[PDB]
Design an enzyme around this catalytic site. Sequence first.
Site, PDB file in Angstrom:
ATOM      1  N   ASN A  89       4.879  21.637 -29.073  1.00 17.16           N
ATOM      2  CA  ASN A  89       4.194  22.041 -30.265  1.00 17.16           C
ATOM      3  C   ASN A  89       3.822  20.885 -31.171  1.00 17.16           C
ATOM      4  O   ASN A  89       4.485  19.855 -31.224  1.00 17.16           O
ATOM      5  CB  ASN A  89       4.968  23.104 -31.060  1.00 17.16           C
ATOM      6  CG  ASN A  89       6.372  22.660 -31.445  1.00 17.16           C
ATOM      7  OD1 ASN A  89       7.018  21.944 -30.675  1.00 17.16           O
ATOM      8  ND2 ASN A  89       6.899  23.135 -32.584  1.00 17.16           N
ATOM      9  N   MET A  90       2.783  21.120 -31.972  1.00 17.86           N
ATOM     10  CA  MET A  90       2.388  20.163 -32.962  1.00 17.86           C
ATOM     11  C   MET A  90       1.966  20.785 -34.280  1.00 17.86           C
ATOM     12  O   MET A  90       1.248  21.774 -34.324  1.00 17.86           O
ATOM     13  CB  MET A  90       1.544  18.977 -32.434  1.00 17.86           C
ATOM     14  CG  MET A  90       0.867  19.225 -31.102  1.00 17.86           C
ATOM     15  SD  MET A  90      -0.363  17.951 -30.692  1.00 17.86           S
ATOM     16  CE  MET A  90       0.747  16.760 -29.874  1.00 17.86           C
ATOM     17  N   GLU A  91       2.451  20.193 -35.362  1.00 19.29           N
ATOM     18  CA  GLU A  91       2.135  20.629 -36.717  1.00 19.29           C
ATOM     19  C   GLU A  91       1.562  19.450 -37.487  1.00 19.29           C
ATOM     20  O   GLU A  91       2.111  18.344 -37.466  1.00 19.29           O
ATOM     21  CB  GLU A  91       3.368  21.140 -37.470  1.00 19.29           C
ATOM     22  CG  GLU A  91       4.419  21.650 -36.463  1.00 19.29           C
ATOM     23  CD  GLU A  91       5.648  22.167 -37.087  1.00 19.29           C
ATOM     24  OE1 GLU A  91       6.279  21.539 -37.934  1.00 19.29           O
ATOM     25  OE2 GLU A  91       6.022  23.290 -36.503  1.00 19.29           O
ATOM     26  N   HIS A 102       0.968  25.468 -30.242  1.00 15.61           N
ATOM     27  CA  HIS A 102       2.252  25.877 -29.715  1.00 15.61           C
ATOM     28  C   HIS A 102       2.571  25.159 -28.411  1.00 15.61           C
ATOM     29  O   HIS A 102       1.684  24.834 -27.616  1.00 15.61           O
ATOM     30  CB  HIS A 102       2.259  27.382 -29.513  1.00 15.61           C
ATOM     31  CG  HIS A 102       2.351  28.117 -30.803  1.00 15.61           C
ATOM     32  ND1 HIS A 102       3.396  28.987 -31.100  1.00 15.61           N
ATOM     33  CD2 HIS A 102       1.518  28.093 -31.866  1.00 15.61           C
ATOM     34  CE1 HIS A 102       3.170  29.445 -32.320  1.00 15.61           C
ATOM     35  NE2 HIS A 102       2.061  28.918 -32.809  1.00 15.61           N
ATOM     36  N   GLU A 104       3.386  26.147 -25.667  1.00 15.98           N
ATOM     37  CA  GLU A 104       2.694  26.798 -24.571  1.00 15.98           C
ATOM     38  C   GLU A 104       1.227  26.480 -24.519  1.00 15.98           C
ATOM     39  O   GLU A 104       0.654  26.419 -23.441  1.00 15.98           O
ATOM     40  CB  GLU A 104       2.762  28.349 -24.681  1.00 15.98           C
ATOM     41  CG  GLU A 104       4.169  28.987 -24.774  1.00 15.98           C
ATOM     42  CD  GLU A 104       4.894  28.852 -26.093  1.00 15.98           C
ATOM     43  OE1 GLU A 104       5.110  27.776 -26.609  1.00 15.98           O
ATOM     44  OE2 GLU A 104       5.432  29.970 -26.507  1.00 15.98           O
ATOM     45  N   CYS A 129       6.288  33.262 -28.925  1.00 20.45           N
ATOM     46  CA  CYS A 129       5.734  34.038 -30.005  1.00 20.45           C
ATOM     47  C   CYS A 129       4.563  34.837 -29.425  1.00 20.45           C
ATOM     48  O   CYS A 129       4.038  34.534 -28.334  1.00 20.45           O
ATOM     49  CB  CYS A 129       5.275  33.112 -31.159  1.00 20.45           C
ATOM     50  SG  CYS A 129       3.650  32.411 -30.771  1.00 20.45           S
ATOM     51  N   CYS A 132       1.282  33.184 -28.544  1.00 17.86           N
ATOM     52  CA  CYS A 132       1.274  32.596 -27.209  1.00 17.86           C
ATOM     53  C   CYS A 132       1.257  33.617 -26.108  1.00 17.86           C
ATOM     54  O   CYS A 132       0.571  33.393 -25.108  1.00 17.86           O
ATOM     55  CB  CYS A 132       2.421  31.624 -26.995  1.00 17.86           C
ATOM     56  SG  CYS A 132       2.305  30.211 -28.115  1.00 17.86           S
TER      57      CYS A 132
END
Lengths: 294, 294
Positions: A89-91, A102, A104, A129, A132
């Site tokens: 994941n990346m934010e 996400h 995934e 989630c 995804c």
Amino acid sequence: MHPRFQTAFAQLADNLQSALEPILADKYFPALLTGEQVSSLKSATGLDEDALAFALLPLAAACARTPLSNFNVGAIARGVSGTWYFGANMEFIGATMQQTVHAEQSAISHAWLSGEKALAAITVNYTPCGHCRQFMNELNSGLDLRIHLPGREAHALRDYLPDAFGPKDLEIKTLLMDEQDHGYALTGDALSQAAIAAANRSHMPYSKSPSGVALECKDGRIFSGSYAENAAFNPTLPPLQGALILLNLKGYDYPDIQRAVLAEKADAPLIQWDATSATLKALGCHSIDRVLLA
Amino acid sequence: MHPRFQTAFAQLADNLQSALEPILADKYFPALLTGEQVSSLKSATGLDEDALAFALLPLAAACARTPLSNFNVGAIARGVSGTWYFGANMEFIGATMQQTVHAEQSAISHAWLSGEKALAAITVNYTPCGHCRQFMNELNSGLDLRIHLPGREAHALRDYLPDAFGPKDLEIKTLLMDEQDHGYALTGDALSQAAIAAANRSHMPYSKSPSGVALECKDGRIFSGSYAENAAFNPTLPPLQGALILLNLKGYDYPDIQRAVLAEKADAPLIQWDATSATLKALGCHSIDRVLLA
Ligand SMILES: O=C1N[C@H](O)C=CN1[C@@H]1O[C@H](CO)[C@@H](O)[C@H]1O
Ligand SMILES: O=C1N[C@H](O)C=CN1[C@@H]1O[C@H](CO)[C@@H](O)[C@H]1O
Ligand SMILES: [Zn+2]
Ligand SMILES: [Zn+2]
């Protein structure tokens, strides 16, 4: 070895460590494993695929970028090719939640972008989630995708997404990972063409607005992303994100981004432009150019 | 009656039509029903709630705005109050898929914004996408929310979202629809204060960036939206969307938007600004102002 793996690597099992160390040795280890490597891995340890994947999770999760959550999530997509692709994941601080990626989506597009024709399974270190599960149902693998989670049995997507909504609901027949080529002529410099090329493989049966983003690194490396629509609309993968996934997985960092181009139709109903610049600027790249498709 | 209902209304049953016509009579029928009205409805027809809700769907779906999909989806959220709130999807040409609104988010925020304390059930004319099942799991109603679909039995959310991911996974204790008040001082004109007030009720336990958007109509009507984060991040409801949901449900149209303000912290990790203007401009409103929270 890329420092991102340092710690993870250290808690791996001795025989696994040994088998790995040669591969992880390279800073630019591409967060991926070929069949051959998997086999090797399986011999050095007595692991079976599934167990092997679970065992590699922490390395996939080492690639996560979570300034917000601090919630590391790794995923491993298993190609029908035998190749395994990592995902995480990346934010992005300075943007919006809608810009998040996400684990995934990361693995699946890692695979898709890399040329993978279909997936057989995916393994995540955390239950997916709904966003995804929905993302998954856009693939040509359908509800059959097999999903592995720690401490659980395997199940098909259908099990995680009962009475599911998907492309068929919209009468859509082309799925994500199916073969596509929109046919735009490639033009301009490298970067421009990398963008257009990505726009060409894009999945956009719902809106019909193709788009692509290519990023040029200091060293002249070029990561490009393809647009990927989703039946539920929202889970769609914007083109920028594609590029950044590759860029990160592959060992690079934001600051190595030199310039970036975005390609799209001018008259498309949906427009990537704004979200693209914005986020790009948020990351510190103000060098955005756009190229008009035709 | 608002033309949007014309056709739908015409295919309603005679006794239902009669019971309704007085209510739908008003152009500005607020796409909602109080307990009292529901009761009345139940007497004029012999319907039970569930059957009544299914029977009203088409009116909820009449409120949909789908230039892209042409896929009308209606939802009805049932307050613990006895009030029923309509909901419908919205797609905005000129923006991105990430800007879309699902029927379900529409109903739930319709309710939330209206002051509803919790929901008991929701009825949709189509099975909820994973994005919405995830959206639902952020509410204080949890996995217990009851969900009604045509031709199916009722089920709790838990059934549609097996082995689900949610706020607990992030150690989040305040749920959506729980009581919140961030305490910012209201200031400026009306619009500014409407914005700040919305920012005050916002759900933002993950990023901690409060935000609100208020829209002023030609006639001086003011619709405002509150920001609503989601554990899976992506399904989060941006503040703009809040306002537009109300605005549409309530009988208005884009072009009636006169001016709009957005409130947020300057230093927040997530920033609504860009997505807000962009979309707003896409809709034809260039009159955006922003107010800094403190
Ligand atoms: O990456 C995933 N995958 C799973 O479906 C569930 C959650 N997360 C995410 O993990 C973080 C917590 O939401 C976010 O970065 C969000 O992208
Ligand atoms: O509104 C809903 N709710 C259900 O979870 C499934 C789909 N849709 C939506 O209906 C359209 C088709 O995706 C879009 O506007 C999208 O928001
Ligand atoms: Zn997810
Ligand atoms: Zn939905």
